[PDB]
Ligand binder design. Structure first.
Ligand SMILES: Nc1ncnc2c1ncn2[C@@H]1O[C@H](COP(=O)(O)OP(=O)(O)O)[C@@H](O)[C@H]1O
Ligand SMILES: Nc1ncnc2c1ncn2[C@@H]1O[C@H](COP(=O)(O)OP(=O)(O)O)[C@@H](O)[C@H]1O
Ligand SMILES: [Mg+2]
Ligand SMILES: [Mg+2]
Ligand SMILES: [Zn+2]
Lengths: 595, 689
DNA sequence: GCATGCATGCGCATGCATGCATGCATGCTGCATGCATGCATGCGCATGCATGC
DNA sequence: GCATGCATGCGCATGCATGCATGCAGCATGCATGCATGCATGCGCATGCATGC
């Protein structure tokens, strides 16, 4: 029967929705979209705990400490408003500051039970998404009537209820047989996941702690194993901890878990979740303005790692790799590469690792590897495991995870042949092929590479040809688009200047660079122009038919490199076509790297 | 009250009447189509009925355009497909014509049993009518007869299977509809909202299970009363009956013990297959998922591992089977029940001549220049490389296999090896050939090793028996096996390839396995020189890591070097950069033939078996003698990959046979041997510049 | 170019979660039995009225 | 007015529905075990690769 407290709380939350008028228009917009486009959006909105705090402290504290009594009223109020506005029940999500209620799996204890929490950690294992039967529909042949039944369980409501275990009907009330109508019944999706303490926060040498989270319906496949995640929900207990009946055993306790309602993926370094930033109109105006200047390439280049001295061409190359070219798919099924790769051979104090770590810190999706750090199955995802359902599966590796991203390799020359043959296919065909006992598949590995290497004799030697100084297979070098050699020669003026620079440090910002790169990579796709065609053809012919001794060989890969660099420079320019200047810049950079 | 009632806009009597009208009325643009099908079924020449929804939509539109009313049968079947199977069965059982052929000693046992059952039914009905009339106590008489008499239900008298096939996009687009049943989906996209519908899935088959009998209705017999008892089964397990339940034994005091009789029981042929996502369907940074398909009836053995297909079926639920402690409510598992299969690439064995295929083949032949036209269409985005493309086409067509008697055997398949400098597009040709072939497989070095090739021992989930799962070499049987980075492999894989090229088999003698596999497949390998680029200052056998004999066992061994030349570089750069500006090749005076027509023509050509005359034999022996004399002097100078041997003669014969087959002729000619020798000579021109 | 250590897959022995049945001793609950009580009746006697006389 | 026979109300035994408990014997059930199966683990051997002489 009706309750007075429930109605009072419903009225108070309706007043709350009245004072703040963003959620009303959010609901209107969702309904408008669903009407016009028929894809269907789920019926849900997000509320800010901060606004609730300014509005009504008692209601705020009730939701924080007594969700089982205050949230269903709020959902009913929202549903009533939604049903009143328009010409499924609606659900709620929470954001803002949770104060002392923001915890981790290690610091979540029995004193937080029945309260709304927000946990952070790493996803370790998900489950198979299964349907759950809610309403069945049947048919009787002797009467021509349709019947139905409803089903419920303990996890579909926050408050405890008296069980009503109804049986599955096979007969009629008069004895006639029934027929199931699978198309007219109703099923809902269901999943269960596990969250652990983050590897970068848990104490060292200690076994970790984890907690289970249950999701339903429209939050069923929003994350994958290995992600950094933030889950907000209600920490709840179920059943009887061996209390009903005798149950002499006392070791077990009360089963506990989280009935989740909000899931947020978080970006970190060296992880599979990519960074994205919301772009406002001020940002777009500023970007489209800066696009019109003539030294834009120079400004964007000098911004990369401004604490390092010189290496301007390597900065330009890193920017070009960040932007990238365009990949082509022919109807027959052929694929043409569009990524850019960079290699660096240099002296042992040339700031190679600093630039490498800069790329790791500024790329939206990057993974850091070292020469002997990862090998075998750790790079190509060639490891196999299996579920407790019986099936065997694969799990992603370094380059499989970094699809559509970049990979940083340090101490490149310390690798072996077994993994170099593996990375050949990644660097050219951009695919990984696995053929083990019970598996035959092909995984996409479209990623770019930047690496740093050491000379054979510790320091680069000008008295010998490059082959004795690099000592790497020619077929491997052919797959690197650009190769740079850096040497430190003592010079009084250069040493002085670098000295004042290093002393200055010891006593365009990056976010705008990230926004610029994201917009450029998402919006513009240029096309080839005949002028650039002629320029690149001339340059390729000249390079292929010259007597100069180079740092790397010359093949058709060089021609494709020229096209890729030209297209990436045009992408930087925000132009929809490639001009002569982009081709000339690509040719100049390639010539400088080669000579 | 408990179990309330609900109202739906679905009337089944109307749909039954519509089904009968369609089954008795439809005309194909001769009597009714389905009536002829049913007559053939009655005469015991058909086992399966296929119901096409295009016919239903055409019938509906025909009824509409002339004014009268009609119901939407297509959508009703689509949304609730599992209920209409029995409606169609019942409608069909009401119209089947009498058999016009007598049952003789050369019929199946099932037909004999069904006919006996029908005769017994009629006899019981007549006996009951006679007794009732003799009692002295005609619609009423037949009604009372029907009330008091048992029979054999219709399901125990059927002999056919019924399947549906979806609405094609063409019919819906012409009639202005949205064919939901034939919009391909990945396993990811199939959610719980699609349960109970008829849907189509696109994927690649990974596993198939052996055919076994699945019992539908069990049969028992009672010596006490003489009745036959039937027990329906629709679960994964069942409990056999113990004591008789017939009216006579039920009413008496002493009941009889039932005994199971396998011959009267109803069985079904069952298979279960797994289907996996294609690469292009998987999202960024994810792993592909799978799905389960059930196949029953005459549709079994229509799926083999490694096939990219579009399966049609009804999406249905099943009981939960996970851990008990992780069950929250009434959870279920999903599976697909197969109704129709289509392949993305047709097999050669299933070839058949017909007007449609014959017209296309005749057009291709009339266009003239079949040889070069087919050769130039292989990977048209690659400039040059015409000779290697001709060799690849010949590898696609193959030679003639010879049975000499006394158990001897001569291969007919041709092996080709490409070996050249970096950046010459070997991998592109490997991949294109793998894509053209209907049973092609692609492998690269260390990724596939050990049981990745050959096969391994595992246990079947469905059945409780041990099996062998084939590797790369067994999956491409009667196809092309492409191997990249041929020189970087391990010794065991090299030995396996060695044996496969030798005698089309793989022998394994290890713990728990002692058997011989079938490896009737062709090899297409790629390799690199030992020091990167080729070094013309060293002997040819010192530039490669493979043994000389292994190289000798290839019919064609191509050398591809990269000598800079300011002229040809211009043409290559123009071709590549044009290919990047547009999506097509630059040539305009020549049109490439699409893969389906190439596959059709090769399938037609493969049926030929040209024979060898005597003058061609004289020419062949003379050429062999001359070439063998020449080769020894070259190999003494340490300037030959290998001395000529009888395998060279066998390769010449095979290539001549392949060219003859391409020409669609029953005899060999001198020009074919000329072309074979021309190819085998031009194979090594890179070594004399 | 030849010999040696190392780390990577085959070939297994062995412990342990899950899940189902079975003889038995346990604990509960209907039930036959013991019983008290207050209401209804079967009936005989003492009183007042009706009918001769 | 005087004497008899019948209704009538008072007084005493006795049967019977109600409603409570109590010792006991029967019956369904939780429990100790009895066991099969499928999975993972740790434990060596055969060996292909990298390193030094
Ligand atoms: N060009 C440079 N500009 C500024 N600092 C430099 C430069 N080269 C070297 N350094 C300094 O020297 C150190 C070199 O470290 P690292 O990046 O490991 O060099 P490498 O990898 O070449 O050994 C850095 O800490 C850096 O601060
Ligand atoms: N003759 C050619 N025509 C067109 N493109 C070529 C040609 N040769 C090489 N290429 C290009 O160069 C690249 C060579 O890489 P790949 O296909 O692995 O061959 P390889 O393994 O011989 O280097 C390819 O992406 C291809 O597009
Ligand atoms: Mg460094
Ligand atoms: Mg290659
Ligand atoms: Zn019987």
């Amino acid at each position: 029967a009706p309750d007075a407290v429930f109605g009072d709380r419903v009225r108070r939350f309706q007043e709350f929705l009245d004072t703040f008028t963003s959620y009303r228009d959010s609901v209107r917009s969702i309904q408008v979209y669903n009407s016009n486009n028929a894809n269907i959006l789920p019926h849900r909105i997000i509320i800010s705990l901060d606004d609730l705090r300014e509005f009504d402290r008692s209601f705020w504290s009730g939701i924080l400490v007594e969700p089982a009594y205050f949230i269903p009223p709020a959902e009913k109020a929202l549903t009533d408003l939604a049903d009143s506005m328009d010409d499924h029940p609606w659900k709620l999500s929470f954001k803002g500051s949770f104060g002392a209620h923001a915890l981790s799996p290690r610091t979540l204890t029995a004193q937080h039970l029945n309260k709304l929490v927000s946990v952070e950690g790493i996803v370790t294992k998900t489950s198979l998404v299964r349907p759950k039967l809610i309403r069945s529909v049947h048919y009787a042949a002797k009467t021509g009537r349709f019947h139905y039944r409803d089903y419920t369980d303990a996890t579909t409501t926050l408050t405890t209820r008296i069980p009503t275990p109804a049986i599955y009907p096979t007969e009629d009330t008069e004895g006639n047989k029934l027929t199931t109508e699978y198309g007219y019944s109703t099923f809902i999706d269901h999943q269960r996941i596990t969250v652990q303490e983050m590897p970068e926060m848990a104490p060292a040498g200690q076994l970790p702690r984890s907690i289970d989270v249950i999701l339903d319906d429209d939050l069923v496949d929003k994350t994958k194993p290995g992600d950094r995640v933030n889950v907000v929900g209600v920490f709840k207990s179920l059943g009887a901890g061996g209390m009903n009946q005798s149950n002499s055993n006392t070791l077990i306790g009360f089963k506990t878990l989280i009935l989740g309602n909000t899931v947020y993926p978080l970006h970190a370094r060296s992880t599979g979740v990519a960074a994205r930033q919301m772009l406002t109109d001020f940002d777009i105006r500023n970007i489209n303005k800066l696009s019109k200047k003539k030294d834009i390439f120079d400004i964007l280049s000098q911004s990369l790692a401004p604490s390092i001295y010189g290496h301007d061409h390597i900065k330009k190359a890193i920017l070009l790799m960040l932007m990238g070219g365009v990949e082509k798919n022919l109807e027959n099924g052929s694929h043409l590469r569009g990524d850019i790769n960079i290699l660096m051979v240099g002296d042992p104090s040339t700031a190679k690792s600093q630039l490498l770590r800069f790329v790791l810190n500024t790329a939206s999706l990057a993974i850091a590897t070292t020469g002997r750090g990862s090998s075998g199955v750790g790079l190509t995802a060639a490891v196999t495991t299996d579920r407790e359902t019986g099936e065997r599966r694969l799990e992603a590796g370094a380059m499989v995870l970094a699809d559509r991203g970049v990979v940083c390799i340090d101490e490149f020359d310390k690798m072996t042949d077994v993994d170099r043959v593996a990375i050949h296919e990644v660097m050219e065909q951009q695919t990984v092929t696995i053929a083990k006992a019970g598996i035959h598949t092909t995984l996409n590995a479209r990623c770019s590479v930047i690496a740093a290497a050491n000379p054979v004799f510790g320091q680069y030697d000008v008295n010998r040809d490059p082959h004795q100084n690099i000592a790497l297979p020619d077929s491997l070098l052919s797959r690197f688009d650009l190769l740079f050699v850096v040497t430190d020669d003592i010079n009084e003026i250069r040493d002085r200047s670098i000295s004042e620079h290093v002393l200055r440090t010891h006593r365009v910002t990056i976010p705008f660079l990230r926004k610029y790169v994201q917009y450029a990579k998402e919006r513009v796709i240029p096309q080839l122009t005949q002028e650039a065609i002629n320029v690149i053809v001339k340059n390729y012919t000249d390079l292929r038919n010259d007597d100069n001794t180079k740092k790397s060989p010359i093949t058709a890969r060089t021609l494709e490199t020229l096209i890729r660099l030209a297209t990436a420079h045009a992408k930087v320019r925000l132009s929809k076509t490639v001009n002569k200047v982009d081709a000339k810049v690509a040719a100049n950079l390639l010539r400088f790297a080669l000579l | 009250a408990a179990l309330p009632s609900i109202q739906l806009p679905v009337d089944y009597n109307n749909l039954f009447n519509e089904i009968t009208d369609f089954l008795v009325t439809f005309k194909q643009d001769k009597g009714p189509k389905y009536m002829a099908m049913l007559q053939k079924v009655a005469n015991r020449e058909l086992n399966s009925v296929i119901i096409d929804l295009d016919d239903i939509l055409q019938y509906q539109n025909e009824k509409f355009l002339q004014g009268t009313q009609a119901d939407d049968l297509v959508s009703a079947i689509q949304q609730n497909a599992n209920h209409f199977t029995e409606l169609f069965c019942r409608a069909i059982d009401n119209n089947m014509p009498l058999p016009t052929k007598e049952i003789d000693y050369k019929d199946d046992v099932l037909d004999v049993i069904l006919n006996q059952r029908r005769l017994r039914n009629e006899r019981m009905l007549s006996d009951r009518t006679n007794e009732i009339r003799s009692e002295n106590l005609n619609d009423a008489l037949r009604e009372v007869v029907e009330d008091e008499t048992e029979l054999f239900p219709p399901n125990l008298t059927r002999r056919y299977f019924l399947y549906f096939k979806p609405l094609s996009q063409n019919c819906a687009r012409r009639y202005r509809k949205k064919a939901i049943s034939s919009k391909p989906l990945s396993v990811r996209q199939i959610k719980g909202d699609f349960l109970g519908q008829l849907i189509t899935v696109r994927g690649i088959i990974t596993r198939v299970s052996d055919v076994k009998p699945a019992v539908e209705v069990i049969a028992y017999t009672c010596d006490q009363c003489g009745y036959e008892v039937f027990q329906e089964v629709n679960s994964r397990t069942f409990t056999p009956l113990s004591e008789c339940t017939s009216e006579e034994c039920s009413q008496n005091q002493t009941k009889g013990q039932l005994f199971m009789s396998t011959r009267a029981s109803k069985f079904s042929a069952f298979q279960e297959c797994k289907i996996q996502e294609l690469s292009q369907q998987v999202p960024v940074g994810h792993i592909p998922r799978s799905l389960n398909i059930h196949v029953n009836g005459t549709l079994v053995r229509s799926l083999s591992p490694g096939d990219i297909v579009d399966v049609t079926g009804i999406f249905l639920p099943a009981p939960y089977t996970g851990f008990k402690a992780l069950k929250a409510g009434l959870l279920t598992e999903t599976y697909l029940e197969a109704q129709f299969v289509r392949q993305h690439k047709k097999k050669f064995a299933s070839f058949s001549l017909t007007s449609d295929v014959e017209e296309r083949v005749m057009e291709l032949i009339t266009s003239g220049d079949v040889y070069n036209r087919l050769a130039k269409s292989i990977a048209p985005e690659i400039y040059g490389n015409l000779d290697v493309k001709k060799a690849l086409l010949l590898l696609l067509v193959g030679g003639v296999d010879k049975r000499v008697g006394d158990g001897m055997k001569i291969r007919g398949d041709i092996n080709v090896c490409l070996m050249g400098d970096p950046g010459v597009a070997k991998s592109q040709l490997l991949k294109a050939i793998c894509k053209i072939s209907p049973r092609g497989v692609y492998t690269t070095g260390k990724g596939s090793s050990g049981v990745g090739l050959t096969a391994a021992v595992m246990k079947d989930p469905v059945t409780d028996e041990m099996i062998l799962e084939g590797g790369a070499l067994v999956l491409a049987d009667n196809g092309i096996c492409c191997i990249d980075e041929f020189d970087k492999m391990d010794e065991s894989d090299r030995t396996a390839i060695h044996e496969v090229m030798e005698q089309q088999t793989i022998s394994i003698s290890k713990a728990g396995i002692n058997t011989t596999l079938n490896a009737r497949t062709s090899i297409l390998a790629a390799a690199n020189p030992l020091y990167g680029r080729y070094n013309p200052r060293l002997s040819p056998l010192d530039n490669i890591n493979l043994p000389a004999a292994l190289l000798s066992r290839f019919d064609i061994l191509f050398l591809m070097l990269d000598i800079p030349s300011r002229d040809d570089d211009e043409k290559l750069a123009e071709h590549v950069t044009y290919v990047h500006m547009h999506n097509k090749q630059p040539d305009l005076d020549f049109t490439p033939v699409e893969p389906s027509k190439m596959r059709e023509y090769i399938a037609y050509a493969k049926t030929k078996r040209p024979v060898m005359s005597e003058a061609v034999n004289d020419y062949v022996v003379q050429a062999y003698i001359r070439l063998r004399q020449d080769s020894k002097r070259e190999m003494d100078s340490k300037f030959s990959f290998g001395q000529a041997t009888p395998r060279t003669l066998l390769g010449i014969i095979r290539l001549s046979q392949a060219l003859a087959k391409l020409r669609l002729a029953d005899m060999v000619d001198i020009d074919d041997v000329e072309e074979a020798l021309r190819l085998v000579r031009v194979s090594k021109e890179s070594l004399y510049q």
